[PDB]
Each structure stands twice: as C-alpha cells, then as structure tokens.
C-alpha cells in the first residue's frame, strides 16, 4: 500500500536523473515552460565543460591545433563574466572543433569533466540558437549539485511511492533509514578508469558504499536493487580503456559484455549474507526513459512479490 524507496550512491552516479525519470514516467512529465526553466542550467553545464577542458590543457601541457584558438580561449573566460550570446557560441564552436582541445577531451580521465559534456557541445548549433527551448532529453542531461534529502511522491501500479534522493545531517539519518521498503543503489560504470583524485579509485569508493549498505542490519528486510548505470558511456569507454585500470587482477577481455559482468560480480560479492538476501541487479541508462521505464517496472514487480510473501500471501 505504501512504499519507502531510497536512492543511494556516489556523486554523479545517476540518482537525481532517476528522479526526473519518475516524474516523466509516472507523472505529468515536463511542460514547455518547465523545460524553459532549465535553459540556464544547460547553458551553464556547457560553459563549465569547455572551460574544464581548456584549463586541463594548462596542467597536461597541451597545445592548440592552431595558435588562433588562444584568442578564442581568452575571450571564453572574459565573456563568461556576463543566457547565450552569438559570439560566445562561435568562441566555443571554434574551440570544440580544434584538434587541440579535442585531444585534451579524449584524455578527460586525467581530470574532472562533465559526462554530458560531449552531448551539449556536439549539439551546440541547436542550443545556441536564440529563443531555443531545451528538449526533455536536454533536461535529463543537466547536472545539478543536489544537497540534502529530497523527497518525491508518485503512484505506480496502485502503490504510493515515497522516494528519497540522498545526496551533514545527524539525527536526520535515523529518521531516513526507518523501515525502508527498497534501496536503489546507483553506480557509474564509466567511472572505472577515473584517476586517483584520496587513495581509492572512484569505482572502489562505490564498492565501499554498497558494501556497508547491503550488509548493514538496517536493511535486513529491505529489497536491495543495484543500478549499474551509465552503460552507454561504459560501452564506448571500454573499447579504448582497459578494465585493469580499475581491477588490475582482471583477466577477461575488454568487451562490454564480459567487463560489465565482471563488475557486477565485484559488487554482488560484497554481499555477506548471500544465503538470506538476494540482490536485484539491472544494467541501466538513467537518461534513457524507455529503459528506466522497463527496469523500474521490473523493480516494482519484485517489491510487490515481496510485500505478499511477508504477510503470507505468496
């Protein structure tokens, strides 16, 4: 009758994007004017990305493919101090096309860059147009630093969902893990080759979290769902970046199917009470609405079947 769902995971793992998908799928969605509201966010995410790339060229010591880009780089920061002009667009277009910044871009594993960077930049002509209005996908691609607990309600298959986006508190934690029906833990598959910021690979940090989750006594009666997310970025990434960067003891081949399977085990093996509790793993793309719909529909079935079994119905 009532379901308390919890979204846990490392930063930029897909938690908040899943939330948007819930409103898109089990609520109204996104109106014309709601999308217009993210226009500023989109422009922001675009600018900070190209900048991050350009900044990285300073550390990594990478030259442009044309000294004429030095001027555009200059103007980028200058113009940033002022929403999308027609001049800034060209400044970014010219930079994004330069073989110089493109080389630094393909080395984004050595610094912090937005995952939606290429998405926006490769579609700049459209976004930069005056009176442009963000598509629903554009909205999903945005990155917003969500802080604090974020409650969200929706009804699906005759169930009232109370979904919490956990992304500083003290006793507020206690009043959060109280009788959680199910936990959806998000993992960014593509974060396996991200450099050592700290002394533990991003992926290893995620395993750390998941370990404490499914093994904790708090969730002995909680359905544990594992969302191996960003499979789309991972599929392309694995072709050029060895999984051994994350797990050096990995003897498998650098294919999507095999490498993904390996990562699934590394997480599922963190389950100590394997005899008592099962982990429901899904390979997802949080920005893919059709996929999230399918995956969440599957999750709901699991939750229903477990609501019955308990109070003796199944």
């Amino acid at each position: 009758a009532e379901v308390k769902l919890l979204l846990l995971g490392a930063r930029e793992s897909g938690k908040s994007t899943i939330v948007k998908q819930m409103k898109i799928i089990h609520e109204a969605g996104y109106s014309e004017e709601e999308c217009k509201q993210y226009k500023a966010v989109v422009y922001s995410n675009t600018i900070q990305s190209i900048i991050a790339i350009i900044r990285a060229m300073g550390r990594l010591k990478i030259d442009f493919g044309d000294s004429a880009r030095a001027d555009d780089a200059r103007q980028l920061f200058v113009l940033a101090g002022a929403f999308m002009t027609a001049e800034l667009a060209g400044v970014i277009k010219r930079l994004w096309k330069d073989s110089g910044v493109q080389a630094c871009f393909n080395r984004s594993r050595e610094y912090q860059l937005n995952d939606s960077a290429a998405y926006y930049l490769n579609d700049l002509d459209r976004i930069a147009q005056p009176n442009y209005i963000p598509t629903q996908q554009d909205v999903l691609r945005t990155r917003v630093k969500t802080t604090g607990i974020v409650e969200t309600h929706f009804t699906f298959k005759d169930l009232h969902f109370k979904m919490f986006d956990v992304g500083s508190e003290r006793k507020k934690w206690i009043h959060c893990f109280e009788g959680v029906t199910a936990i959806i833990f998000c993992v960014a598959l593509s974060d396996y080759d991200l450099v050592l910021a700290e002394e533990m690979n991003r992926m290893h940090e995620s395993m750390k979290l998941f370990d404490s989750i499914c093994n904790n006594k708090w969730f002995t009666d909680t359905s544990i769902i594992l969302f191996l997310n960003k499979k789309d970025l991972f599929e392309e990434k694995i072709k050029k970046s060895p999984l051994t960067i994350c797990y050096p003891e990995y003897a498998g081949s650098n294919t999507y199917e095999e490498a993904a399977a390996y990562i699934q085990c590394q997480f599922e093996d963190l389950n100590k009470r394997k005899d008592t509790k099962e982990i429901y793993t899904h390979f997802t793309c949080a920005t893919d609405t059709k996929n999230v719909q399918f995956v969440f529909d599957a999750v709901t079935d699991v939750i229903i079947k477990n609501n019955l079994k308990d109070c003796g119905l199944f």
């Binding site: 846990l8 956990v166 508190e169 934690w173 750390k208 979290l209 404490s212 989750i213 708090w218």
Partner: peptide, 6 residues
C-alpha cells in the same frame, strides 16, 4: 555523513 553513519 550518511556513509560513516552506518
């Protein structure tokens, strides 16, 4: 934070 909390 909520990690060490556990």
């Amino acid at each position: 934070t909520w990690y060490d909390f556990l």
